């Protein structure tokens, strides 16, 4: 599980209504829950096992000629050209994303919502109810405070400063 003390390798912590996760920088993809690395452009023989997308690596296909494709890791499946957990294949949240219930030994998909939205019990726990979510991110950098950007929380520059660093 990802907490406020997790170090996002080549990434940064973001917070939604029900969990935290690591978002990568620029064109980096998630190797695991907290590590971001460069992705390959084409799945070659040389790029086998190298990451091609979020939670996906290039593999070899023992076909009639050798073939290479970008397959999601174990426990993930491809939905809209994005690898999401297998238990989230048919869980749509609307104003949010599907995550695994960390407080349940059996893998179950639940809806984590954008900032300002909470799971609506009257809409199959989808993200269709107004509701604030207090930010718990530790933004300790020079003039960095928690800011809501693109439906998520993130440590950004204080209002009136721009990036080397915030000033």
């Amino acid at each position: 599980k990802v907490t406020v003390d997790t170090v996002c390798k080549r990434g940064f912590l973001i917070q939604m209504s029900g969990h935290l996760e690591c978002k990568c920088e620029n064109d980096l993809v998630l190797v695991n829950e907290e590590t971001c690395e460069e992705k390959v452009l084409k799945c070659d023989e040389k790029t086998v096992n190298k990451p091609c997308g979020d939670f996906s690596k290039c593999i070899k296909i023992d076909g009639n000629p050798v073939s290479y494709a970008c397959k999601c890791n174990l426990g993930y499946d491809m939905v809209n050209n994005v690898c999401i957990p297998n238990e989230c294949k048919q869980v749509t949240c609307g104003n949010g994303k599907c995550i695994l219930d960390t407080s349940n030994p059996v893998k179950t998909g639940v809806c984590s919502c954008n900032i300002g939205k909470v799971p609506n019990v009257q809409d199959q726990n989808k993200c269709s109810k107004d509701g604030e979510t207090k930010c718990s991110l530790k933004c300790l950098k020079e003039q960095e405070t928690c800011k809501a950007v693109d439906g998520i929380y993130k440590c950004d520059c204080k209002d009136g400063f721009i990036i080397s660093i915030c000033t």
Partner: antibody
Amino acid sequence: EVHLVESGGGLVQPGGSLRLSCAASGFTFSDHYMDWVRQAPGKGLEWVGRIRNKANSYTTDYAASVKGRFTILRDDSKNSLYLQMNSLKTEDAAVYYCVRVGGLGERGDYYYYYMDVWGKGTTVTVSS
Amino acid sequence: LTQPPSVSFSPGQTARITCSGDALSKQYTYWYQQKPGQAPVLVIYKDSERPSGIPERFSGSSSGTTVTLTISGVQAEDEADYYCQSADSSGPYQVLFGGGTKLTVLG
């Protein structure tokens, strides 16, 4: 500069109906939520209800004390907010404030829900 | 929401008004200043931050289910009624208001 001008207040007998109005100006009215907040003479603030923007399907929500009796309407093409009050009780007599809800993002949805702009208010009296 | 009905401080002192409630641990708390015969004005949002146009003497702090409004060096200009607000998304959306606090700058 932002302005919220209430209208329609007056004296009505108990059980009667009354409709309020609010002319907004100085901002994109269709982007914001709009709320009604009332305040009895010499008492605290009480929330009436809320109407949402097109991005949230113009849905509504009210307080339990005015549920079923009050109804909030809006006309984005006229920058107007309305409050249809029915079956008025003497407890409903108060000054009603037209309120704009701030804290929205670039998506039409909000990150926070606060009341940044208030109006001068209109007075509603209920007595026979 | 629950807040004291009245507080009193001498000029220059640091006034504090507390707002308590179980919904204060889930969503943020907002403070409004209302002078006699005038519309309320937001002075503190998101527990501790202040909007643009509010003097630096206004501030707040959050500790669990209790939020405290702080006014350092109270001016007679600050004598007004203060209401704390929040929200409850447990069922239908509900805006929560406190009883209000009459801040008197002693004269």
